[PDB]
Design a binder for these strands. Structure first.
Lengths: 145, 53, 107, 143, 141
RNA sequence: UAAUUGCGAUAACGAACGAGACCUUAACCUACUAAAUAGUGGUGCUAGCAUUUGCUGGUUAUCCACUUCUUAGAGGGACUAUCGGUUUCAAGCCGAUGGAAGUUUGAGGCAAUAACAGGUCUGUGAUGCCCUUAGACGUUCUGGGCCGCACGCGCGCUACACUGACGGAGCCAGCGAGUCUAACCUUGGCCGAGAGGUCUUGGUAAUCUUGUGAAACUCCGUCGUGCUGGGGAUAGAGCAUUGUA
């Protein structure tokens, strides 16, 4: 089909999302490696970026690894439906606010401060620190509790 | 003369109680029986009796 | 034709002996009093399809119990009688519970 | 002339007629492929990430004779898979129905499959010609 | 009225018609072979009734059957042993006498549920008891 | 030895029960002048190749008869016998194992003898028992806790792999309900990322949701063992179902 004849374009560890990435894996797995992004989201941005799965770290360098990040940030100018994703019409105005790397760990507590402001059961059970999604834990509780 | 002795009773365990002896079991609505477990033994000849096995 | 013989299979089905003896004595005395052909019935291994509403939830302890069993004594007649008297057997001795499968098959 | 009623098989049929239909250009892709999980009872989508519609097409193409007719109510069952409810055992669950109906309608429009009387689908004459003679020719070529 | 009988014949667990089609060793019926299966599990198991007994051994016998009944697992586990009995025993009119005697003497020390035909028949059970190996399902009190 | 089971002698004689007292079992009759849902020749022509007749509808009182599988009633099998020793044969062991059965006939059922300060007085107005009806020994009523955990005990599993995956045939088991005054109601069609949403089709159903179809199994191209692919009793946003809830 295709014989390996690449040259030494593979370079040192590239910088992305203030961390390091392994230079011994496909770029799709390299994207799943980052916090804030998983399997389905990774392959979604990949197959919307239209890149073949026979490319090593030599291709798609740091300058070619910005089209992918920018089309990930901007689903508007390319007809990305952004309803196959999770977050849409969430709390603000109705617009699709797709999930993102730092946005998630900066927004994870807006709902919480809302909930303990209202003083609901989802707030006070969380303040107690016990299990919240409705599981009975009468007997055990050795290590966590 | 009481106004507040009524109460909604149409479905669920709060509506339908036993009819056997004001018993405490028998949550089985088979053919509208709702008969108890000691009551199934009080019933005589509904088991289909025969003994070889 | 006139005086047709299509032979709808009369399916003698009973539960109790008071109705079983009733229908069997009825059909044989009918045959005796209007002189039908002398061919009598015999019983069968009864057509039991297994259906029941059991109320035995959980298996603890030992067995001091009976057997849930019942015999619907579905029998038959090996004869060559007319469809007319086959119909009149259903018309007379009215008791709801006797089924007749519409089957055009004599023997 | 000696050729019997059928000379068909399964794996040779699939992995040959896939490329044969790719040469012929009969894509009939439903458009929203390779975005969906492809089954309500799978862990992830396929890993090739491009097409894989002939992998279903040439499979059903001889399924439609290995069974006399093909029923989607059993197809999604047979394509079902195991799923976990957290701290629970694994349960078999049916596959997707939407994509099955869409590919079936696509091939109906193409004219390979066809809705037969008495409930079910039969194979059209293009598929019948693909079944008998050219299958024998292709396998005699690649064997 | 007319003595028209259907030629009812017996098989392992199903019915059959008693009119065989003779031939020239053609193991098929006119539109489909059966033997090309390729299971990837029971290959040596299906080669056992033939490969140990004689490779072709079909110059004077065909299988000409169409029956709907029994089951698929029963079919696969019965028809091969059935034609094994046909080729080792019914061939006594044809096969060499000392050869078949050697074969029967060889299989006397081989009857370990490999050369046994499936004589299973469906049977209904009665309502009132379900247990086979574990215990029954009864309540206290 | 699964047994108070057989030999054998005797203050022993002759009798019932636990097994023996019975029947369902597991791979059962060229068998039952037994039924159109489980099917066969001739086939009613072929709509898959239509000359290489098995078949597609068994041309909706439908190519006829019947059971040869859906319904199972009888009598019938296997017994250590034909071999020799291991008891003196009077018990019992082997291998030629003989098949609807060499383990008594595998698995199942009789609560036999007579007792338990055993669970059931709170089980059906069941026992010589302490007290009342106006503040009913609270019949009922607006609702909700009856799953709160600093702790340990007990049966039940999701992993600690190249065993995680696409593609496919893997599907060979009876199991269960139905308005008759309220929820069982489609096999198929169509929309959806999916809970799911609408119709000939199911109230007298072997008949319609049911023509119950039980599941991951071998495979190769590729990623690919790690605290990361090994997963989720952990926390968050949105899509709707059964149920006033």
């Amino acid at each position: 089909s295709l014989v390996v004849q690449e040259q030494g374009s593979f370079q040192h560890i590239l910088r992305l999302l203030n961390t390091n990435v392994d230079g011994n894996i496909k770029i799709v797995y390299a994207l799943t490696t980052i916090k804030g992004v998983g399997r389905r989201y990774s392959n979604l941005v990949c197959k919307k970026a239209d890149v073949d799965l026979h490319k090593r770290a030599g291709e798609l360098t740091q300058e070619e690894l910005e089209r992918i990040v920018q089309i990930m940030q901007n689903p508007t100018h390319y007809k990305i439906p952004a309803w196959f994703l999770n977050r849409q019409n969430d709390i603000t105005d109705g617009k699709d606010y797709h999930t993102l790397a730092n946005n998630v760990e900066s927004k994870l507590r807006d709902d919480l401060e809302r909930l303990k402001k209202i003083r609901a059961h989802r707030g006070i059970r969380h303040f107690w620190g016990l299990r919240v999604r409705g599981q009975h834990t009468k007997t055990t509780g050795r290590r966590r509790a | 003369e009481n106004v507040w002795f009524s109460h909604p009773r149409r479905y669920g365990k709060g509506s339908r109680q036993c009819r056997v002896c004001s018993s405490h079991t028998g949550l089985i609505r088979k053919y509208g029986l709702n008969i108890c477990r000691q009551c199934f033994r009080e019933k005589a000849n509904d088991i289909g009796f025969n003994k070889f096995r | 034709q006139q005086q047709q013989i299509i032979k709808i299979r009369i399916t003698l089905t009973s539960t109790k002996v008071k109705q079983l003896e009733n229908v069997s004595s009825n059909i044989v005395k009918n045959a005796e009093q209007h002189n039908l052909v002398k061919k009598g019935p015999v019983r069968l291994p009864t057509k039991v399809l297994k259906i029941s509403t059991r109320k035995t939830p959980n298996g603890e302890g030992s067995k001091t119990w009976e057997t849930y069993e019942m015999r619907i004594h579905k029998r038959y007649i090996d004869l060559e009688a007319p469809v007319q008297i086959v119909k009149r057997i259903t018309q007379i001795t009215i008791e709801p519970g006797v089924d007749v499968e519409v089957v055009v098959a004599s023997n | 002339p000696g050729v019997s009623v059928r000379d068909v098989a399964a794996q040779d049929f699939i992995n040959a007629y896939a490329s044969f239909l790719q040469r012929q250009g009969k894509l009939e892709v439903p458009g929203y492929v390779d975005i969906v999980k492809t089954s309500s009872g799978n862990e992830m989508p396929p890993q090739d990430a491009e097409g894989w519609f002939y992998k279903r097409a040439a499979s059903v193409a001889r399924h439609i004779y290995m069974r006399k007719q093909v029923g989607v109510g059993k197809l999604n069952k047979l394509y079902g898979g195991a799923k976990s409810r957290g701290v629970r055992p694994y349960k078999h669950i049916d596959a997707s129905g939407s994509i099955n109906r869409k590919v079936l309608q696509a091939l109906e429009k193409i004219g390979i499959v066809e809705i037969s009387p008495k409930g079910g689908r039969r194979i059209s004459e293009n598929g019948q010609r693909d079944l008998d003679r050219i299958a024998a020719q292709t396998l005699e070529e690649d064997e | 009225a007319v003595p028209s009988v259907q030629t009812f014949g017996k098989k392992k667990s199903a019915t059959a018609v008693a009119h065989v089609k003779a031939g020239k060793g053609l193991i098929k019926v006119n539109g489909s072979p059966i033997t090309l299966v390729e299971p990837e599990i029971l290959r040596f198991k299906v080669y056992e009734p033939l490969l140990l007994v004689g490779l072709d051994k079909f110059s004077n016998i065909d299988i000409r059957v169409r029956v709907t009944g029994g089951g698929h697992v029963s079919q696969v586990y019965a028809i091969r042993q059935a034609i094994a009995k046909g080729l080792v025993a019914y061939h006594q009119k044809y096969v060499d006498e000392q050869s078949k005697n050697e074969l029967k003497k060889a299989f006397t020390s081989y009857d370990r549920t490999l050369l046994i035909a499936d004589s299973r028949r469906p049977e209904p059970k009665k309502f009132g008891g379900k247990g086979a190996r574990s215990r029954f399902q009864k309540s206290y009190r």
